């Protein structure tokens, strides 16, 4: 009997004032929340933000919407949301958000007989996350999502995670290319501004960076270029064109890798660990070229000393490079 | 009682003309401003602008909204803002702005018993900032936000910073990697257009650019290449091939560094200080090559004169380079 349902819904929305919160003038209305994380698409060090898609569900009680004589939850067309009160929830650290709207607005309104309202949205949000890159690429970051009431103070509304630590689901399924999610945490607190105290929910993730990409991207290329630079010591000293070609090509490849590295990062004013490693590699290749310059300089009158210097550099440079790698990987691990 | 407040608000909005300002036809209405800065996302020289996010709060008195019998301040659902008069405040130097709308429009309306309205918005705006880059990268910028009334002249409306020096908060939340905030300033004034006089608030920041590693990353390579070009003075003049090779290599390397560097920096169209520095270094290396050309020209008939000219170049060139560096760093610092 759809006519009775229609009459009941018309009666519930008769004289209903959306300008007033539930229990206006009385105790604060308690709003529970939960989130299903569908995906975390892209994490950007350049922009210091991450993108996240989620199903965001809010639960509250509105005694003006209690109905009798129908033993069912009433899932209603989402346009009824424009005729009801909803919480004024927002995200502090977001930079640009939107609700999906294909094929219609991705919104859900479900009434329960006792007056409980379930209000669901599907949201894609970009959120700010300041990153500490002092230990890059061996770093660990903490990215948060802050959820707050905009207009209502703690005397009108209260937030709580509905279900405790089970209120956020789908984190273990998330796959990120450069990162892995070590842990996620849920916090509830109050925040005081000049206009009063407001409830605050925080959802934080701790991300540990995978090293394999950096091994494949900067570490292995640097090692291979350094070995190529060491190939010069085994060519006879009178082949000037070959060894100068080797030196110039290795230096240029070092510069290209370094420029790519610094391109993929923000313009921070301090020295990073990877910067230290890259300038170590540059020092090594420059020293190899200077060694060749010296040998070519002194070899006309002392061929034996030049041969001895080249032969000893054949051993000394790999050993010192190994020591530098040891020191670097021991200071950061 | 919720019905009593409902009918009180219905009586407040009954007979309310949204087309008329408070005290229309009488003394001007005073509007107090407040800004709570959340972040400055980015500062762009190429686009000559910056992105700012803020809570913008407006305070005024509308006698038509006064109510009695309720010793409380009514925090209303923000949709009621579509039924009230609000000031037509705009930002003169903004280029693209939006109000955040997730989960709802980030808007706040608070009424007080005597008729005071507090109206809050969360706004992200990309505002223009004409930067003078003549001293770049050692430059200091001044970026402003201009707040004005569009339609109402000084006869209708007045602006003032609410709280004086404390009207703008959150300046310590501004975290720019490439800049630091030195000072902020608040200004109130009037602006005359052909349609009358309008109130104008102004919020300005002074940005100081951070030098560190990146300043060195450019200026040092040219100096080092110039010194390598000075290495030619100590090599005997019988080595025509070696010295000619040194001069050509240093010159061509200077040209390559300059071209790649300009291909790297932002594409400002005008000439910067660093361009003048690089051109000075180019002039020095070209003069060193010309000096060698002269030495090669005269040394076969006047070797003693050639040796004296080389010895004096040995002394003069480092001295003139030091003078050039001294003058440059005195003028630009």
């Amino acid at each position, epitope marked *: 009997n759809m006519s009775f349902v229609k009459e009941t819904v018309d009666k519930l929305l008769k004289g209903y004032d959306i300008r007033l919160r539930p229990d206006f003038g009385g105790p604060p209305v308690c709003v529970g929340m939960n989130i299903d994380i569908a995906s975390i698409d892209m994490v950007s060090e350049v922009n210091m933000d991450y993108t996240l898609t989620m199903y965001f569900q809010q639960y509250w009680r509105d005694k003006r919407l209690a109905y009798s004589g129908i033993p069912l939850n009433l899932t209603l067309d989402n346009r009824v949301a424009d005729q009801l009160w909803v919480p004024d929830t927002y995200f502090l650290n977001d930079k640009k958000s939107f609700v999906h709207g294909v094929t219609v607005k991705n919104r859900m309104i479900r009434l329960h007989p006792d007056g409980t309202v379930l209000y669901g949205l599907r949201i894609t949000t970009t959120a700010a996350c300041m990153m500490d890159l002092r230990r890059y690429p061996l770093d660990e970051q903490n990215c948060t999502l802050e959820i707050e009431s905009y207009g209502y103070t703690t005397d009108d509304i209260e937030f709580y995670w509905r279900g405790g630590d089970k209120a956020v689901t789908g984190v273990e399924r998330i796959e990120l290319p450069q990162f892995s999610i070590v842990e996620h945490r849920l916090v509830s607190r109050n*925040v*005081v501004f000049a206009t009063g105290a407001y409830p605050r929910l925080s959802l934080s993730f701790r991300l540990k960076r995978n090293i394999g990409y950096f091994i494949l991207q900067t570490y292995m290329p640097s090692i291979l270029i350094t070995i190529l630079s060491w190939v010069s010591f085994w060519i006879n000293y009178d082949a000037s064109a070959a060894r100068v070609a080797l030196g110039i090509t290795t230096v240029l490849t070092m510069t290209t890798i370094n420029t790519h590295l610094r391109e993929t990062l923000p313009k921070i004013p301090y020295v990073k660990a990877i910067d230290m490693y890259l300038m170590g590699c540059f020092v090594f290749v420059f020293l190899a070229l200077l060694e060749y310059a010296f040998v070519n300089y002194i070899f006309f009158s002392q061929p034996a000393r030049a041969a001895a210097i080249d032969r000893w550099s054949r051993i000394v440079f790999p050993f010192t490079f190994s020591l530098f790698n040891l020191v670097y990987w021991l200071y950061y691990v | 009682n919720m019905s009593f407040v409902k009918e009180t608000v219905d009586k407040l909005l009954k007979g309310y003309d949204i087309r008329l300002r408070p005290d229309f036809g009488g003394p001007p209405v005073c509007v107090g401003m407040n800004i709570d800065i959340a972040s400055i996302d980015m500062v762009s020289e190429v686009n000559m602008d910056y992105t700012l996010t803020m809570y913008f709060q407006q305070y005024w008195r509308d006698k038509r909204l006064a109510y009695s019998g309720i010793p409380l301040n009514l925090t209303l659902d923000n949709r009621v803002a579509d039924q009230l008069w609000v000031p037509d405040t705009y930002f003169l130097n903004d280029k693209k702005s939006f109000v955040h709308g997730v989960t709802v429009k980030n808007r706040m309306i608070r009424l007080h018993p005597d008729g005071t309205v507090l109206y809050g918005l969360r706004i992200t705006t990309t505002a223009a900032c004409m930067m003078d880059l003549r001293r770049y990268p050692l430059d200091e910028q001044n970026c402003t936000l201009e707040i004005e009334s569009y339609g109402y002249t000084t006869d209708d409306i007045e602006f003032y910073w609410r709280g004086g020096d404390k009207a703008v908060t959150g300046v*310590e939340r501004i975290e720019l990697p490439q800049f630091s905030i030195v000072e902020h300033r608040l200004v109130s004034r009037n602006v005359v257009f052909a349609t009358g006089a309008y109130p104008r608030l102004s919020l300005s920041f002074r940005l100081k650019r951070n030098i560190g590693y990146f300043i060195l990353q450019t200026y040092m390579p040219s100096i080092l290449i110039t010194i390598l070009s000075w290495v030619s003075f100590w090599i005997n003049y019988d080595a025509s091939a070696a010295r000619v090779a040194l001069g050509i290599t240093t010159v061509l390397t200077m040209t390559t560094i300059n071209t790649h560097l300009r291909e790297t920096l932002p594409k400002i169209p005008y000439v910067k200080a660093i361009d003048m520095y690089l051109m000075g270094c180019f002039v020095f290396v070209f003069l060193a090559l010309l000096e060698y050309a002269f030495v090669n020209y005269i040394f076969f008939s006047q070797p003693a004169r050639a040796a004296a000219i080389d010895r004096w170049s040995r002394i003069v060139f480092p001295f003139t380079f030091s003078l050039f560096n001294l003058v440059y760093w005195l003028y630009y610092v």
Partner: nanobody
Amino acid sequence: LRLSCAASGHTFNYPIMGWFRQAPGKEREFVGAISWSGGSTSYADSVKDRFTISRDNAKNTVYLEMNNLKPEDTAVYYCAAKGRYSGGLYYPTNYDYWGQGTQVT
């Protein structure tokens, strides 16, 4: 006189340090705040032009130099850390990690 607050651990997640003082009969009162990186100080009215705050990241320390003292400056002093999105700068509730109390007469 000069008070030093040295912080260790996750100083990146708490980029702001603040100073408070507690009177024998009154609640905690904000004195000043300093940013770890920006070095942008903020002061209460009662200690403007008199107290100064400086920061050094070498050993993660913040110094409060007190000059031109007065007998109305006899309160137990505390140092605290504030989160990145913790709200207003003048409210003790928004500060998580509090140091040990220090007495001044």
